[PDB]
């Protein structure tokens, strides 16, 4: 079972529908609607932290959830859950070097984590946002994906020893055919003992 934390976002329906086609059951909450205690009682197999709107925003969402379940349950962060993962492990959220033009990006990657075996580059759509700062990235985080256009930005992070990954692109990118493979990769991950 997948527990998904969003903010009643427009993209959530499409992700829920595809996850059922993979034979996964999903339960959706806003951050105020379930506690750490009740998440533990439900014993989900995966957490997806994807609260929006996906806009420039200094706030970190579900920070206590991410810190508490790090090393208990695999975590995928999308929309603001990507920057929240970065913050939860000591990263800094900063404004990007350039304002992005258009809606699409080529996302290059090092075949690690959820990008394992994906076409390089990964074609995705984007939103305006702050970004994880490369120069101060915590030692326990590794960059898995990035753009080359502008002077480039981090587009994917993963914890070096725990099944926790964040991706910066718009959640609708998960519904492409290569996005389908990215999500499948996440669902393979299991927490260590």
PDB file of N, CA and C in Angstrom, residues 85-187:
ATOM      1  N   UNK A  85      12.518  16.945   0.961  1.00  0.00           N
ATOM      2  CA  UNK A  85      13.535  15.928   1.225  1.00  0.00           C
ATOM      3  C   UNK A  85      14.899  16.586   1.369  1.00  0.00           C
ATOM      4  N   UNK A  86      15.224  17.500   0.454  1.00  0.00           N
ATOM      5  CA  UNK A  86      16.508  18.177   0.530  1.00  0.00           C
ATOM      6  C   UNK A  86      16.689  18.923   1.835  1.00  0.00           C
ATOM      7  N   UNK A  87      15.633  19.604   2.295  1.00  0.00           N
ATOM      8  CA  UNK A  87      15.712  20.339   3.555  1.00  0.00           C
ATOM      9  C   UNK A  87      15.804  19.405   4.738  1.00  0.00           C
ATOM     10  N   UNK A  88      15.103  18.273   4.672  1.00  0.00           N
ATOM     11  CA  UNK A  88      15.032  17.423   5.842  1.00  0.00           C
ATOM     12  C   UNK A  88      16.395  16.862   6.189  1.00  0.00           C
ATOM     13  N   UNK A  89      17.300  16.814   5.219  1.00  0.00           N
ATOM     14  CA  UNK A  89      18.620  16.239   5.420  1.00  0.00           C
ATOM     15  C   UNK A  89      19.711  17.290   5.401  1.00  0.00           C
ATOM     16  N   UNK A  90      19.356  18.546   5.658  1.00  0.00           N
ATOM     17  CA  UNK A  90      20.323  19.616   5.802  1.00  0.00           C
ATOM     18  C   UNK A  90      20.560  20.468   4.574  1.00  0.00           C
ATOM     19  N   UNK A  91      19.869  20.200   3.472  1.00  0.00           N
ATOM     20  CA  UNK A  91      20.092  20.966   2.267  1.00  0.00           C
ATOM     21  C   UNK A  91      19.462  22.343   2.336  1.00  0.00           C
ATOM     22  N   UNK A  92      19.955  23.220   1.471  1.00  0.00           N
ATOM     23  CA  UNK A  92      19.483  24.592   1.369  1.00  0.00           C
ATOM     24  C   UNK A  92      18.666  24.744   0.099  1.00  0.00           C
ATOM     25  N   UNK A  93      17.553  25.450   0.215  1.00  0.00           N
ATOM     26  CA  UNK A  93      16.666  25.716  -0.903  1.00  0.00           C
ATOM     27  C   UNK A  93      16.894  27.161  -1.319  1.00  0.00           C
ATOM     28  N   UNK A  94      17.245  27.379  -2.590  1.00  0.00           N
ATOM     29  CA  UNK A  94      17.642  28.697  -3.075  1.00  0.00           C
ATOM     30  C   UNK A  94      16.955  28.980  -4.406  1.00  0.00           C
ATOM     31  N   UNK A  95      16.986  30.250  -4.821  1.00  0.00           N
ATOM     32  CA  UNK A  95      16.476  30.577  -6.139  1.00  0.00           C
ATOM     33  C   UNK A  95      17.441  30.085  -7.213  1.00  0.00           C
ATOM     34  N   UNK A  96      16.874  29.679  -8.347  1.00  0.00           N
ATOM     35  CA  UNK A  96      17.662  29.187  -9.461  1.00  0.00           C
ATOM     36  C   UNK A  96      18.425  30.334 -10.121  1.00  0.00           C
ATOM     37  N   UNK A  97      19.421  29.965 -10.922  1.00  0.00           N
ATOM     38  CA  UNK A  97      20.266  30.961 -11.571  1.00  0.00           C
ATOM     39  C   UNK A  97      19.471  31.782 -12.578  1.00  0.00           C
ATOM     40  N   UNK A  98      18.619  31.122 -13.365  1.00  0.00           N
ATOM     41  CA  UNK A  98      17.807  31.796 -14.368  1.00  0.00           C
ATOM     42  C   UNK A  98      16.346  31.419 -14.179  1.00  0.00           C
ATOM     43  N   UNK A  99      15.461  32.324 -14.591  1.00  0.00           N
ATOM     44  CA  UNK A  99      14.061  31.973 -14.755  1.00  0.00           C
ATOM     45  C   UNK A  99      13.932  31.069 -15.967  1.00  0.00           C
ATOM     46  N   UNK A 100      13.280  29.931 -15.799  1.00  0.00           N
ATOM     47  CA  UNK A 100      13.137  29.027 -16.927  1.00  0.00           C
ATOM     48  C   UNK A 100      12.074  29.532 -17.889  1.00  0.00           C
ATOM     49  N   UNK A 101      12.352  29.393 -19.179  1.00  0.00           N
ATOM     50  CA  UNK A 101      11.398  29.736 -20.217  1.00  0.00           C
ATOM     51  C   UNK A 101      10.715  28.484 -20.742  1.00  0.00           C
ATOM     52  N   UNK A 102       9.448  28.630 -21.113  1.00  0.00           N
ATOM     53  CA  UNK A 102       8.736  27.450 -21.565  1.00  0.00           C
ATOM     54  C   UNK A 102       8.336  26.533 -20.414  1.00  0.00           C
ATOM     55  N   UNK A 103       8.017  25.294 -20.790  1.00  0.00           N
ATOM     56  CA  UNK A 103       7.472  24.293 -19.883  1.00  0.00           C
ATOM     57  C   UNK A 103       8.263  22.995 -19.828  1.00  0.00           C
ATOM     58  N   UNK A 104       9.224  22.778 -20.719  1.00  0.00           N
ATOM     59  CA  UNK A 104       9.872  21.479 -20.847  1.00  0.00           C
ATOM     60  C   UNK A 104      11.375  21.577 -20.623  1.00  0.00           C
ATOM     61  N   UNK A 105      11.951  20.457 -20.191  1.00  0.00           N
ATOM     62  CA  UNK A 105      13.378  20.351 -19.954  1.00  0.00           C
ATOM     63  C   UNK A 105      13.845  18.976 -20.400  1.00  0.00           C
ATOM     64  N   UNK A 106      15.099  18.916 -20.818  1.00  0.00           N
ATOM     65  CA  UNK A 106      15.812  17.661 -20.969  1.00  0.00           C
ATOM     66  C   UNK A 106      16.537  17.398 -19.657  1.00  0.00           C
ATOM     67  N   UNK A 107      16.244  16.264 -19.032  1.00  0.00           N
ATOM     68  CA  UNK A 107      16.792  15.915 -17.727  1.00  0.00           C
ATOM     69  C   UNK A 107      17.795  14.790 -17.940  1.00  0.00           C
ATOM     70  N   UNK A 108      19.077  15.102 -17.772  1.00  0.00           N
ATOM     71  CA  UNK A 108      20.142  14.116 -17.872  1.00  0.00           C
ATOM     72  C   UNK A 108      20.394  13.501 -16.508  1.00  0.00           C
ATOM     73  N   UNK A 109      20.911  12.273 -16.510  1.00  0.00           N
ATOM     74  CA  UNK A 109      21.013  11.530 -15.264  1.00  0.00           C
ATOM     75  C   UNK A 109      22.169  10.543 -15.347  1.00  0.00           C
ATOM     76  N   UNK A 110      22.511   9.967 -14.193  1.00  0.00           N
ATOM     77  CA  UNK A 110      23.637   9.042 -14.077  1.00  0.00           C
ATOM     78  C   UNK A 110      23.192   7.599 -13.840  1.00  0.00           C
ATOM     79  N   UNK A 111      21.972   7.254 -14.257  1.00  0.00           N
ATOM     80  CA  UNK A 111      21.414   5.902 -14.166  1.00  0.00           C
ATOM     81  C   UNK A 111      21.356   5.366 -12.737  1.00  0.00           C
ATOM     82  N   UNK A 112      21.258   6.252 -11.752  1.00  0.00           N
ATOM     83  CA  UNK A 112      21.171   5.855 -10.355  1.00  0.00           C
ATOM     84  C   UNK A 112      19.753   6.055  -9.830  1.00  0.00           C
ATOM     85  N   UNK A 113      19.380   5.231  -8.855  1.00  0.00           N
ATOM     86  CA  UNK A 113      18.098   5.427  -8.190  1.00  0.00           C
ATOM     87  C   UNK A 113      16.928   5.178  -9.115  1.00  0.00           C
ATOM     88  N   UNK A 114      15.934   6.074  -9.057  1.00  0.00           N
ATOM     89  CA  UNK A 114      14.744   5.938  -9.889  1.00  0.00           C
ATOM     90  C   UNK A 114      15.004   6.207 -11.364  1.00  0.00           C
ATOM     91  N   UNK A 115      16.172   6.724 -11.731  1.00  0.00           N
ATOM     92  CA  UNK A 115      16.505   6.920 -13.137  1.00  0.00           C
ATOM     93  C   UNK A 115      17.183   5.702 -13.762  1.00  0.00           C
ATOM     94  N   UNK A 116      17.399   4.645 -12.981  1.00  0.00           N
ATOM     95  CA  UNK A 116      18.030   3.412 -13.452  1.00  0.00           C
ATOM     96  C   UNK A 116      17.405   2.918 -14.747  1.00  0.00           C
ATOM     97  N   UNK A 117      18.216   2.862 -15.803  1.00  0.00           N
ATOM     98  CA  UNK A 117      17.790   2.322 -17.080  1.00  0.00           C
ATOM     99  C   UNK A 117      16.850   3.194 -17.880  1.00  0.00           C
ATOM    100  N   UNK A 118      16.650   4.442 -17.477  1.00  0.00           N
ATOM    101  CA  UNK A 118      15.797   5.340 -18.234  1.00  0.00           C
ATOM    102  C   UNK A 118      16.578   5.923 -19.408  1.00  0.00           C
ATOM    103  N   UNK A 119      15.858   6.268 -20.478  1.00  0.00           N
ATOM    104  CA  UNK A 119      16.470   7.028 -21.566  1.00  0.00           C
ATOM    105  C   UNK A 119      17.212   8.237 -21.012  1.00  0.00           C
ATOM    106  N   UNK A 120      18.401   8.477 -21.534  1.00  0.00           N
ATOM    107  CA  UNK A 120      19.170   9.664 -21.170  1.00  0.00           C
ATOM    108  C   UNK A 120      19.290  10.537 -22.407  1.00  0.00           C
ATOM    109  N   UNK A 121      18.706  11.749 -22.428  1.00  0.00           N
ATOM    110  CA  UNK A 121      18.024  12.405 -21.310  1.00  0.00           C
ATOM    111  C   UNK A 121      16.567  11.999 -21.121  1.00  0.00           C
ATOM    112  N   UNK A 122      16.030  12.374 -19.965  1.00  0.00           N
ATOM    113  CA  UNK A 122      14.623  12.208 -19.632  1.00  0.00           C
ATOM    114  C   UNK A 122      13.899  13.499 -20.015  1.00  0.00           C
ATOM    115  N   UNK A 123      12.937  13.404 -20.934  1.00  0.00           N
ATOM    116  CA  UNK A 123      12.139  14.563 -21.310  1.00  0.00           C
ATOM    117  C   UNK A 123      11.042  14.785 -20.274  1.00  0.00           C
ATOM    118  N   UNK A 124      11.019  15.962 -19.642  1.00  0.00           N
ATOM    119  CA  UNK A 124       9.991  16.216 -18.640  1.00  0.00           C
ATOM    120  C   UNK A 124       9.424  17.614 -18.793  1.00  0.00           C
ATOM    121  N   UNK A 125       8.362  17.876 -18.039  1.00  0.00           N
ATOM    122  CA  UNK A 125       7.801  19.207 -17.927  1.00  0.00           C
ATOM    123  C   UNK A 125       8.182  19.790 -16.575  1.00  0.00           C
ATOM    124  N   UNK A 126       8.087  21.110 -16.474  1.00  0.00           N
ATOM    125  CA  UNK A 126       8.650  21.808 -15.338  1.00  0.00           C
ATOM    126  C   UNK A 126       7.659  22.812 -14.781  1.00  0.00           C
ATOM    127  N   UNK A 127       7.936  23.225 -13.553  1.00  0.00           N
ATOM    128  CA  UNK A 127       7.258  24.340 -12.927  1.00  0.00           C
ATOM    129  C   UNK A 127       8.320  25.322 -12.448  1.00  0.00           C
ATOM    130  N   UNK A 128       7.889  26.521 -12.076  1.00  0.00           N
ATOM    131  CA  UNK A 128       8.801  27.474 -11.456  1.00  0.00           C
ATOM    132  C   UNK A 128       8.951  27.129  -9.983  1.00  0.00           C
ATOM    133  N   UNK A 129      10.186  27.138  -9.490  1.00  0.00           N
ATOM    134  CA  UNK A 129      10.417  26.710  -8.120  1.00  0.00           C
ATOM    135  C   UNK A 129      11.779  27.190  -7.664  1.00  0.00           C
ATOM    136  N   UNK A 130      11.978  27.166  -6.350  1.00  0.00           N
ATOM    137  CA  UNK A 130      13.334  27.156  -5.836  1.00  0.00           C
ATOM    138  C   UNK A 130      13.953  25.783  -6.079  1.00  0.00           C
ATOM    139  N   UNK A 131      15.272  25.698  -5.898  1.00  0.00           N
ATOM    140  CA  UNK A 131      16.024  24.503  -6.249  1.00  0.00           C
ATOM    141  C   UNK A 131      16.925  24.118  -5.086  1.00  0.00           C
ATOM    142  N   UNK A 132      17.322  22.844  -5.061  1.00  0.00           N
ATOM    143  CA  UNK A 132      18.278  22.415  -4.056  1.00  0.00           C
ATOM    144  C   UNK A 132      19.645  22.984  -4.425  1.00  0.00           C
ATOM    145  N   UNK A 133      20.333  23.564  -3.448  1.00  0.00           N
ATOM    146  CA  UNK A 133      21.615  24.215  -3.726  1.00  0.00           C
ATOM    147  C   UNK A 133      22.707  23.159  -3.884  1.00  0.00           C
ATOM    148  N   UNK A 134      23.398  23.189  -5.027  1.00  0.00           N
ATOM    149  CA  UNK A 134      24.428  22.190  -5.316  1.00  0.00           C
ATOM    150  C   UNK A 134      25.650  22.363  -4.422  1.00  0.00           C
ATOM    151  N   UNK A 135      26.057  23.610  -4.173  1.00  0.00           N
ATOM    152  CA  UNK A 135      27.358  23.858  -3.563  1.00  0.00           C
ATOM    153  C   UNK A 135      27.393  23.484  -2.085  1.00  0.00           C
ATOM    154  N   UNK A 136      26.229  23.404  -1.428  1.00  0.00           N
ATOM    155  CA  UNK A 136      26.119  23.079  -0.008  1.00  0.00           C
ATOM    156  C   UNK A 136      25.381  21.765   0.229  1.00  0.00           C
ATOM    157  N   UNK A 137      25.317  20.903  -0.780  1.00  0.00           N
ATOM    158  CA  UNK A 137      24.531  19.682  -0.653  1.00  0.00           C
ATOM    159  C   UNK A 137      25.090  18.802   0.461  1.00  0.00           C
ATOM    160  N   UNK A 138      24.228  18.263   1.329  1.00  0.00           N
ATOM    161  CA  UNK A 138      24.704  17.395   2.412  1.00  0.00           C
ATOM    162  C   UNK A 138      25.458  16.173   1.903  1.00  0.00           C
ATOM    163  N   UNK A 139      26.411  15.727   2.728  1.00  0.00           N
ATOM    164  CA  UNK A 139      27.231  14.579   2.380  1.00  0.00           C
ATOM    165  C   UNK A 139      26.399  13.323   2.174  1.00  0.00           C
ATOM    166  N   UNK A 140      25.227  13.232   2.803  1.00  0.00           N
ATOM    167  CA  UNK A 140      24.430  12.019   2.698  1.00  0.00           C
ATOM    168  C   UNK A 140      23.521  12.014   1.479  1.00  0.00           C
ATOM    169  N   UNK A 141      23.500  13.098   0.708  1.00  0.00           N
ATOM    170  CA  UNK A 141      22.704  13.176  -0.503  1.00  0.00           C
ATOM    171  C   UNK A 141      23.609  13.101  -1.727  1.00  0.00           C
ATOM    172  N   UNK A 142      23.090  12.503  -2.793  1.00  0.00           N
ATOM    173  CA  UNK A 142      23.804  12.380  -4.053  1.00  0.00           C
ATOM    174  C   UNK A 142      22.924  12.906  -5.187  1.00  0.00           C
ATOM    175  N   UNK A 143      23.528  13.615  -6.147  1.00  0.00           N
ATOM    176  CA  UNK A 143      22.770  14.116  -7.294  1.00  0.00           C
ATOM    177  C   UNK A 143      22.584  12.982  -8.292  1.00  0.00           C
ATOM    178  N   UNK A 144      21.326  12.737  -8.690  1.00  0.00           N
ATOM    179  CA  UNK A 144      20.984  11.726  -9.682  1.00  0.00           C
ATOM    180  C   UNK A 144      20.550  12.293 -11.024  1.00  0.00           C
ATOM    181  N   UNK A 145      20.171  13.565 -11.084  1.00  0.00           N
ATOM    182  CA  UNK A 145      19.665  14.115 -12.328  1.00  0.00           C
ATOM    183  C   UNK A 145      19.874  15.619 -12.310  1.00  0.00           C
ATOM    184  N   UNK A 146      19.963  16.198 -13.500  1.00  0.00           N
ATOM    185  CA  UNK A 146      20.329  17.601 -13.615  1.00  0.00           C
ATOM    186  C   UNK A 146      19.956  18.084 -15.004  1.00  0.00           C
ATOM    187  N   UNK A 147      19.835  19.405 -15.141  1.00  0.00           N
ATOM    188  CA  UNK A 147      19.708  20.009 -16.460  1.00  0.00           C
ATOM    189  C   UNK A 147      21.055  20.556 -16.905  1.00  0.00           C
ATOM    190  N   UNK A 148      21.209  20.670 -18.220  1.00  0.00           N
ATOM    191  CA  UNK A 148      22.373  21.327 -18.798  1.00  0.00           C
ATOM    192  C   UNK A 148      22.071  22.745 -19.266  1.00  0.00           C
ATOM    193  N   UNK A 149      20.826  23.014 -19.647  1.00  0.00           N
ATOM    194  CA  UNK A 149      20.423  24.346 -20.083  1.00  0.00           C
ATOM    195  C   UNK A 149      20.416  25.333 -18.916  1.00  0.00           C
ATOM    196  N   UNK A 150      20.661  26.602 -19.240  1.00  0.00           N
ATOM    197  CA  UNK A 150      21.115  27.636 -18.276  1.00  0.00           C
ATOM    198  C   UNK A 150      22.495  27.170 -17.804  1.00  0.00           C
ATOM    199  N   UNK A 151      22.868  27.429 -16.560  1.00  0.00           N
ATOM    200  CA  UNK A 151      24.067  26.824 -16.006  1.00  0.00           C
ATOM    201  C   UNK A 151      23.741  25.542 -15.250  1.00  0.00           C
ATOM    202  N   UNK A 152      22.520  25.043 -15.414  1.00  0.00           N
ATOM    203  CA  UNK A 152      22.083  23.754 -14.899  1.00  0.00           C
ATOM    204  C   UNK A 152      21.589  23.836 -13.471  1.00  0.00           C
ATOM    205  N   UNK A 153      20.683  22.913 -13.125  1.00  0.00           N
ATOM    206  CA  UNK A 153      20.145  22.793 -11.775  1.00  0.00           C
ATOM    207  C   UNK A 153      19.954  21.317 -11.446  1.00  0.00           C
ATOM    208  N   UNK A 154      19.923  21.025 -10.142  1.00  0.00           N
ATOM    209  CA  UNK A 154      19.628  19.677  -9.664  1.00  0.00           C
ATOM    210  C   UNK A 154      18.181  19.336  -9.984  1.00  0.00           C
ATOM    211  N   UNK A 155      17.962  18.167 -10.590  1.00  0.00           N
ATOM    212  CA  UNK A 155      16.619  17.683 -10.886  1.00  0.00           C
ATOM    213  C   UNK A 155      16.267  16.387 -10.172  1.00  0.00           C
ATOM    214  N   UNK A 156      17.240  15.705  -9.574  1.00  0.00           N
ATOM    215  CA  UNK A 156      16.981  14.508  -8.807  1.00  0.00           C
ATOM    216  C   UNK A 156      18.027  14.348  -7.724  1.00  0.00           C
ATOM    217  N   UNK A 157      17.599  13.965  -6.522  1.00  0.00           N
ATOM    218  CA  UNK A 157      18.505  13.646  -5.426  1.00  0.00           C
ATOM    219  C   UNK A 157      18.136  12.270  -4.896  1.00  0.00           C
ATOM    220  N   UNK A 158      19.104  11.620  -4.260  1.00  0.00           N
ATOM    221  CA  UNK A 158      18.781  10.428  -3.492  1.00  0.00           C
ATOM    222  C   UNK A 158      19.681  10.357  -2.269  1.00  0.00           C
ATOM    223  N   UNK A 159      19.141   9.777  -1.200  1.00  0.00           N
ATOM    224  CA  UNK A 159      19.932   9.481  -0.015  1.00  0.00           C
ATOM    225  C   UNK A 159      20.946   8.384  -0.332  1.00  0.00           C
ATOM    226  N   UNK A 160      22.169   8.547   0.163  1.00  0.00           N
ATOM    227  CA  UNK A 160      23.219   7.616  -0.241  1.00  0.00           C
ATOM    228  C   UNK A 160      23.021   6.226   0.351  1.00  0.00           C
ATOM    229  N   UNK A 161      22.368   6.120   1.503  1.00  0.00           N
ATOM    230  CA  UNK A 161      22.188   4.822   2.135  1.00  0.00           C
ATOM    231  C   UNK A 161      20.739   4.459   2.438  1.00  0.00           C
ATOM    232  N   UNK A 162      19.779   5.377   2.259  1.00  0.00           N
ATOM    233  CA  UNK A 162      18.385   5.091   2.563  1.00  0.00           C
ATOM    234  C   UNK A 162      17.535   5.252   1.306  1.00  0.00           C
ATOM    235  N   UNK A 163      16.425   4.499   1.181  1.00  0.00           N
ATOM    236  CA  UNK A 163      15.564   4.539  -0.021  1.00  0.00           C
ATOM    237  C   UNK A 163      14.673   5.776  -0.060  1.00  0.00           C
ATOM    238  N   UNK A 164      15.308   6.925  -0.262  1.00  0.00           N
ATOM    239  CA  UNK A 164      14.644   8.235  -0.257  1.00  0.00           C
ATOM    240  C   UNK A 164      15.134   8.990  -1.491  1.00  0.00           C
ATOM    241  N   UNK A 165      14.206   9.382  -2.374  1.00  0.00           N
ATOM    242  CA  UNK A 165      14.557  10.086  -3.602  1.00  0.00           C
ATOM    243  C   UNK A 165      13.613  11.258  -3.841  1.00  0.00           C
ATOM    244  N   UNK A 166      14.166  12.342  -4.361  1.00  0.00           N
ATOM    245  CA  UNK A 166      13.376  13.493  -4.790  1.00  0.00           C
ATOM    246  C   UNK A 166      13.657  13.809  -6.247  1.00  0.00           C
ATOM    247  N   UNK A 167      12.612  14.204  -6.973  1.00  0.00           N
ATOM    248  CA  UNK A 167      12.742  14.654  -8.351  1.00  0.00           C
ATOM    249  C   UNK A 167      12.077  16.015  -8.474  1.00  0.00           C
ATOM    250  N   UNK A 168      12.712  16.901  -9.221  1.00  0.00           N
ATOM    251  CA  UNK A 168      12.313  18.306  -9.285  1.00  0.00           C
ATOM    252  C   UNK A 168      11.263  18.603 -10.351  1.00  0.00           C
ATOM    253  N   UNK A 169      11.041  17.702 -11.305  1.00  0.00           N
ATOM    254  CA  UNK A 169      10.183  18.034 -12.429  1.00  0.00           C
ATOM    255  C   UNK A 169       8.701  17.916 -12.043  1.00  0.00           C
ATOM    256  N   UNK A 170       7.839  18.457 -12.910  1.00  0.00           N
ATOM    257  CA  UNK A 170       6.407  18.516 -12.627  1.00  0.00           C
ATOM    258  C   UNK A 170       5.828  17.106 -12.527  1.00  0.00           C
ATOM    259  N   UNK A 171       4.955  16.842 -11.547  1.00  0.00           N
ATOM    260  CA  UNK A 171       4.438  15.470 -11.373  1.00  0.00           C
ATOM    261  C   UNK A 171       3.807  14.871 -12.616  1.00  0.00           C
ATOM    262  N   UNK A 172       3.305  15.688 -13.541  1.00  0.00           N
ATOM    263  CA  UNK A 172       2.704  15.112 -14.740  1.00  0.00           C
ATOM    264  C   UNK A 172       3.734  14.373 -15.582  1.00  0.00           C
ATOM    265  N   UNK A 173       5.031  14.637 -15.371  1.00  0.00           N
ATOM    266  CA  UNK A 173       6.068  13.900 -16.075  1.00  0.00           C
ATOM    267  C   UNK A 173       6.091  12.427 -15.697  1.00  0.00           C
ATOM    268  N   UNK A 174       5.465  12.056 -14.579  1.00  0.00           N
ATOM    269  CA  UNK A 174       5.444  10.659 -14.165  1.00  0.00           C
ATOM    270  C   UNK A 174       4.530   9.844 -15.065  1.00  0.00           C
ATOM    271  N   UNK A 175       3.629  10.495 -15.780  1.00  0.00           N
ATOM    272  CA  UNK A 175       2.641   9.784 -16.573  1.00  0.00           C
ATOM    273  C   UNK A 175       3.085   9.554 -18.003  1.00  0.00           C
ATOM    274  N   UNK A 176       4.240  10.076 -18.402  1.00  0.00           N
ATOM    275  CA  UNK A 176       4.801   9.662 -19.671  1.00  0.00           C
ATOM    276  C   UNK A 176       5.245   8.204 -19.583  1.00  0.00           C
ATOM    277  N   UNK A 177       5.637   7.649 -20.732  1.00  0.00           N
ATOM    278  CA  UNK A 177       6.070   6.255 -20.751  1.00  0.00           C
ATOM    279  C   UNK A 177       7.378   6.067 -19.997  1.00  0.00           C
ATOM    280  N   UNK A 178       8.297   7.016 -20.120  1.00  0.00           N
ATOM    281  CA  UNK A 178       9.515   6.945 -19.332  1.00  0.00           C
ATOM    282  C   UNK A 178       9.255   7.321 -17.878  1.00  0.00           C
ATOM    283  N   UNK A 179       8.306   8.226 -17.637  1.00  0.00           N
ATOM    284  CA  UNK A 179       7.870   8.478 -16.275  1.00  0.00           C
ATOM    285  C   UNK A 179       7.298   7.237 -15.618  1.00  0.00           C
ATOM    286  N   UNK A 180       6.568   6.422 -16.389  1.00  0.00           N
ATOM    287  CA  UNK A 180       6.069   5.154 -15.862  1.00  0.00           C
ATOM    288  C   UNK A 180       7.208   4.292 -15.341  1.00  0.00           C
ATOM    289  N   UNK A 181       8.327   4.255 -16.074  1.00  0.00           N
ATOM    290  CA  UNK A 181       9.475   3.448 -15.666  1.00  0.00           C
ATOM    291  C   UNK A 181      10.137   4.008 -14.418  1.00  0.00           C
ATOM    292  N   UNK A 182      10.217   5.342 -14.316  1.00  0.00           N
ATOM    293  CA  UNK A 182      10.773   5.975 -13.126  1.00  0.00           C
ATOM    294  C   UNK A 182      10.010   5.550 -11.877  1.00  0.00           C
ATOM    295  N   UNK A 183       8.675   5.571 -11.942  1.00  0.00           N
ATOM    296  CA  UNK A 183       7.860   5.228 -10.784  1.00  0.00           C
ATOM    297  C   UNK A 183       7.989   3.750 -10.441  1.00  0.00           C
ATOM    298  N   UNK A 184       7.958   2.889 -11.463  1.00  0.00           N
ATOM    299  CA  UNK A 184       8.215   1.467 -11.263  1.00  0.00           C
ATOM    300  C   UNK A 184       9.508   1.239 -10.498  1.00  0.00           C
ATOM    301  N   UNK A 185      10.566   1.955 -10.872  1.00  0.00           N
ATOM    302  CA  UNK A 185      11.833   1.855 -10.156  1.00  0.00           C
ATOM    303  C   UNK A 185      11.658   2.160  -8.676  1.00  0.00           C
ATOM    304  N   UNK A 186      10.871   3.195  -8.357  1.00  0.00           N
ATOM    305  CA  UNK A 186      10.693   3.548  -6.954  1.00  0.00           C
ATOM    306  C   UNK A 186      10.000   2.422  -6.200  1.00  0.00           C
ATOM    307  N   UNK A 187       8.965   1.843  -6.802  1.00  0.00           N
ATOM    308  CA  UNK A 187       8.171   0.842  -6.117  1.00  0.00           C
ATOM    309  C   UNK A 187       8.965  -0.433  -5.840  1.00  0.00           C
TER     310      UNK A 187
END
